[PDB]
Amino acid sequence: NIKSLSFPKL
């Protein structure tokens, strides 16, 4: 669940 939370790339 919370393991697959990805922040965007910049």
Add this chain to the structure above:
Amino acid sequence: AHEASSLYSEEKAKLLREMMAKIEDKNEVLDQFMDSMQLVDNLDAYSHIPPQLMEKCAALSVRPDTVRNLVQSMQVLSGVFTDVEASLKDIRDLLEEDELLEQKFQEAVGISITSKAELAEVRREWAKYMEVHEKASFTNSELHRAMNLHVGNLRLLSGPLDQVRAALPTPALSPEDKAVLQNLKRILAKVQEMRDQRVSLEQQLRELIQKDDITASLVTTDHSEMKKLFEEQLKKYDQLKVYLEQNLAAQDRVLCALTEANVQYAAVRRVLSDLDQKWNSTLQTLVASYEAYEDLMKKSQEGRDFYADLESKVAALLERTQSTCQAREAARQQLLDRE
């Protein structure tokens, strides 16, 4: 002569075969009842903290106040989130006010390509950071809901071990239910002893026959004395069969006691089964909260690094925005004045 010893080996083999039959029957019954009832005293284990959970508690103490620092770090990440949102809102307000003034200016009279093109780049770059910010909005929100979901157990796992052990459910059995457990445990003990003595008594009978075939055959030799000698050996065999028959007969009274105890055990059995279900349930939420703690450490770091990079870009875009909008307004001041 050779036929008298052969007739006696058949009589010894027959009584041994009748013995092995009565034993297999009694064991068949006995095994079916054990398998059908499925039946222990490890109730103190509920009062112990599993070793794997203690290793996780100790891991939350090798670094002091790790749950407190994670909670604070989450508040910092929540803080820079709202800061970014507010700077993105400031840039929007500047673009909206500038676009309004430009429409009013182009109405009051019939510009500058450079500032127009810089103002268009600010708009493009703003919408880029708006799309990236709203994308990471659900992620940030889920990260904080997960934190709130597990922080109570993480505080529990960080505190003293006695409060962890107190969170686990313990058996609360009345003296009547303990008696039902003791009586059931006493009968099962009697069943096992009955099994052991049965195996033992059969071995003795087999060894008594085996030793008689080593003696009155493999070394010695008789004549017409085979009649009295076979009666001597047969007397020894019959005394063991008496003990074995007592062992077989005793099984019937014991099975009646066990099935009756099993009926009294039915209420205790469900209570203890619900206690085991509940015990492993609370244990698995503690394990899950520790697993979430590792994932939170990782994602909290990724979020603070992402939003720090994003805050720096949005702060720098806000500078370009207010500079471009201020210059464009000074141009409208000069032009509309000389009119």
